[PDB]
């Protein structure tokens, strides 16, 4: 129902300012505010949003409060001043969801029949992209339970829009543009090796959760099947790529030919002007 999102950072800063509005007062749990959107294709876009007050006691996670009158009033405001927008969901600032969130979702899926949430983090350090998307559909179950209404993790990204970075890249000021040729590749090496194989090792920690625990949905439906998509390469010892060392030599082939020829021509670049201007400066210096 949702293909992916195209989410601008402006709405994230529009979360940040209301986070500032709640960091100064008695903060019980978190922020629940409105997420407007510009839904055009099965892809999604958001240009703007606003918040709504919210409190929640924790006794039966059912005591939680919005103001639909205020919501539809400021929706009428921003709909009049901009007829492109409409509501598309909500957001929350606490990075881990909880069981009240389905009640939030289905209670605001009455205006438009879809309401995608947005996890964010006001103090992000370890995550990748803040923007996250769920959708509430049913697969019902293998055991076909009475309405196993599940959030379904839709893919996400940070969006892009022309000249919205006019403030941004002027503000941050620290950007080393076009570090191709230096150390960006090894930053990606450190982070993708370590920070992806730790995702892998926490997947195998979840496998240890399946060992000592994990009766719950032990999930022999999607786990080993997408892991069989991984297991397209069962890379055991003896390494099994006698039929790929020549292909690796073919990979080395053209680039090393370019390296040999071209860097010989690069020495040929440097030496000419270097010698000529060198002895020019040297014996015409006096």
């Amino acid at each position: 129902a949702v293909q992916k999102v195209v989410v601008h950072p402006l709405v994230l800063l529009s979360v940040v300012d209301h986070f500032n509005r709640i960091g100064k007062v008695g903060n019980q749990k978190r922020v629940v505010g409105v997420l407007l959107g510009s839904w055009q294709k099965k892809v999604l876009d958001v240009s703007n949003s606003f918040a709504v007050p919210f409190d929640e006691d924790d006794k039966d996670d059912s005591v939680w409060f919005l103001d639909h009158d205020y919501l539809e009033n400021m929706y009428g405001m921003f709909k009049k001043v901009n007829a492109r927008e409409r509501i598309v969901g909500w957001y929350h600032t606490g990075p881990k969801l909880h069981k009240n969130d389905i009640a939030i979702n289905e209670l605001m899926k009455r205006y438009c029949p879809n309401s995608v949430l947005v996890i964010i983090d006001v103090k992000p350090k370890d995550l990748g992209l803040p923007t996250e998307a769920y959708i509430s559909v049913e697969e019902v179950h293998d055991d076909g339970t009475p309405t196993s209404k599940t959030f379904e993790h839709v893919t996400s990204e940070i969006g892009a829009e022309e000249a919205e970075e006019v403030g941004v890249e002027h503000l941050l000021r620290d950007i080393k543009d076009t570090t191709v040729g230096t150390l960006s590749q090894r930053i990606t090496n450190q982070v993708h090796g370590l920070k992806g194989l730790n995702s892998k090792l926490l997947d195998i920690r979840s496998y240890l959760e399946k060992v000592a625990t994990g009766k719950l949905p032990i999930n022999h439906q999607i786990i080993y099947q997408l892991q069989d998509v991984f297991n397209l390469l069962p890379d055991v010892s003896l390494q099994e790529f006698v039929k790929a060392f020549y292909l690796k030599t073919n990979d080395q082939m053209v680039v090393v030919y370019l390296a040999s020829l071209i860097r010989s021509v690069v020495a040929l670049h440097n030496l000419i002007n270097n010698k000529i201007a060198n002895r020019d400066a040297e014996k015409k210096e006096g």
Partner: protein, 152 residues
């Protein structure tokens, strides 16, 4: 008729002789089976076209498949022998739109027809598919792990 056309899988010519030669004696309609098979001066040319059908029934799926099989094994899975293979496959290599591969050298053939002009789609398929599935592995395996620790 339709089973001879859905994925096609092989065929035996004599089982076709059974199934579609007991129809030339069994009568409900009798005139089209006469005009196509029971006739001789044109119906036997349509029997020749049926032989075209059984051999193209071979050649279509064997152009879809069979990378590194031999040749006498090929002819006995063609249900038509090696001289019949040169006849029945010369008259469809004159179709000259299917590229296949045979060698002799003692009577042994091989395959993999384009001679592999690829180091490109290896990288494409292998690395782009696997790396993007691995960046999905985070986004949905830690999602389901966080789900199974929502329900714990």
């Amino acid at each position: 008729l339709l089973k001879l056309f859905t994925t096609m899988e092989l065929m035996r010519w004599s089982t076709l002789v059974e199934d579609y030669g007991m129809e030339l004696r069994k009568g409900s309609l009798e005139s089209p089976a006469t005009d196509v098979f029971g006739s001789t001066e044109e119906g036997e040319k349509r029997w020749k076209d049926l032989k075209n059908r059984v051999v193209e029934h071979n050649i279509r799926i064997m152009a879809k498949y069979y990378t590194r099989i031999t040749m006498k094994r090929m002819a006995q899975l063609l249900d038509l022998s090696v001289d019949e293979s040169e006849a029945f496959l010369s008259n469809l290599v004159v179709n000259k739109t299917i590229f296949a591969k045979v060698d002799r050298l003692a009577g042994i053939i091989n395959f993999q027809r384009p001679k592999d002009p690829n180091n490109l789609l290896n990288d494409w398929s292998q690395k782009l598919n696997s790396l993007m599935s691995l960046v999905n592995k985070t986004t949905h395996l830690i999602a389901k792990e966080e789900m199974i620790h929502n329900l714990q």
